[PDB]
Structure formats: structure tokens, C-alpha cells
Symmetry: C5
Subunit: 69 residues, 5 copies
């Protein structure tokens, strides 16, 4: 899967349909994987750098692959 964005998590958003939105770099992407919610929030709080991999690399795109550094 191609890299989409790398950077710190600016903010996260819990959505009405239980999906989770994240803003990294200049893209706002979302995931339907529930396991990622607490993982992404921890990364936001501790200031980790994440790389999100997805073919839908555009605002509103989905992802399910993340690298925590």
C-alpha cells in the first residue's frame, strides 16, 4: 500500500456511525476499524509520528493501515 501522509496527529474525531476520523498533515481520513481508535488517540496524546497508508489519499478517504513511530 502506498504512503499517503506522515506527521503528528493534529486531531481525532469520533463519528456518529462509530468510525474514527484523524487529521494528519493536510489530509482528513477515517477508519472503520475499532481497534485503531484507542491506538490513534494514544499516538495523539504522546505526540508520536504516524504514517497512514492508503490508495484513497484525499480528504474523506478511508484507511486501515498505520505505522506508529
Amino acid at each position: 500500500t502506498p504512503d499517503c501522509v506522515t506527521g503528528k496527529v493534529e486531531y481525532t474525531k469520533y463519528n456518529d456511525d462509530d468510525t474514527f476520523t484523524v487529521k494528519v498533515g493536510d489530509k482528513e481520513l477515517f477508519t472503520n476499524r475499532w481497534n485503531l481508535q484507542s491506538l490513534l488517540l494514544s499516538a495523539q496524546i504522546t505526540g508520536m509520528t504516524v504514517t497512514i497508508k492508503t490508495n484513497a489519499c484525499h480528504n474523506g478517504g478511508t484507511f486501515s493501515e498505520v505505522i506508529f513511530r
Copy 2:
């Protein structure tokens, strides 16, 4: 969904019916989304600023959308 309140979490409450209550700003709101429980407590502990979006923007109103800044 319109913004309702923005601020730090003053306190949280675990309810008898397994719902979760949060006090942000001047509104006391609750959610039935179990996933939000640990996320909201983490936000409380680390002192994050949260934005709750909901049409039921009044005390005792419900929500399921939260932005963690």
C-alpha cells in the same frame, strides 16, 4: 452536526444503564457509545480540549460526535 460546547472535561460519570456522562463548559451531556468511555476519560486526565457536536445541545442531551484537540 452543529458544535455544542468546547472546553476541557470538568468531570465524567459512569451511569447505572452503562451510558457515560460528561461535563464540558456549562452543559452536562451523555453518550451511549461504549467506545467513547475510555477516550473521554483519557481526554479528562491529559487535559485535552474537546468539542462536542450535537443537535440536543442542552443539559441531559445526548451526543456521539466528539473532536479531540
Copy 3:
């Protein structure tokens, strides 16, 4: 539901039947809500003040309502 005890969490105990015991103030109370286990341990570790609301306000009594401050 009436307030029972308020104070820091002195200690927590995981029970053989998967219920969770907590000692706040002078009372030792237990809950069968699994969601409360990690929340209460976090409150103990971070030194939060909790308020437990219950009608069974006596040693060995049950609760399912907690305010985290």
C-alpha cells in the same frame, strides 16, 4: 441515587467472579460492570477523586455509578 463516599481510591481488587472491588474512604464496595475496571484503575493511578453513588452504602455493597473528578 444518593452519594455514598467521596475520596481517592485506596486500593482495587480483582475478584474470582470477575467483579471489581474498590476502597474509597471507609467503605469497600464492588461492581459487576466490566467497563468500570480500567476506568477505576486509571483513577487510582492518577490520583483522581471519585464519588460513588449507591443505595447499598455499606461494606460489601454494590455500585454502578461513579463520578470522576
Copy 4:
């Protein structure tokens, strides 16, 4: 249930059958309660003193009761 060991968590081990092993004092014990996994790791990380209560108080013995202080 009788006290078995008291002290800090020296190390923990995730096992192949999804049980969790903990080394407290001079005993290595394990539990099959999934709820205890994150609780025990938190206790290891923060340096809490734990008391494990069990009748099988010997290396390789099982437990399901823990006191966190």
C-alpha cells in the same frame, strides 16, 4: 483465598494460549482472565505493589485474584 506473594511486577509474559504470566517476588504464576492483562501491565509500568491471592501458590500456579495498591 490465602495471600501468595506481594511485591512489584518483575516481568509479564503473554502466552501462546492467550493466558498471561506474571512474576512477583519469587513465584511465576499465570491467569486466564483476559481483563487482568492490561491491568497487570499498567501495574508493572507504574510500579504498583500487588498482592496475588491463590491456593496454587507455587511456580506455574494459576490465579484470578489480585489486589492493587
Copy 5:
């Protein structure tokens, strides 16, 4: 199960199929145990030394046993 690698977690990766990848030492290994996801991230954040035991000790190999020191 024989020791494979020992060291700090360089990075973790959430995979498309809900498995979890970890890089320790010079090996990149993955696990299908969901319970290990938050445990491993906590280990990465706090800088613990972990020992991964597995017979599939090579890049892309699987594991389900971890010692958290």
C-alpha cells in the same frame, strides 16, 4: 518456544487484516492476537525491553509470545 529477538520496539504497524506488526532488533514480525495490540503499543511508548519468542524467527514471521521486561 525459543527466543527470537530482544530489544525496544522500534515501531509498530496496524495491518489491513487486523493483525499487528512489530519491529524489534532486526526482525519485523506480526501477530494475530488482538490482546497484544495495546500491550505492545504501551511497551513502545514507555520504552520497555521486550523479548519475542517464536520458531518463525525471520522477517514476516508470526509470534504470540512476548516477555515484557
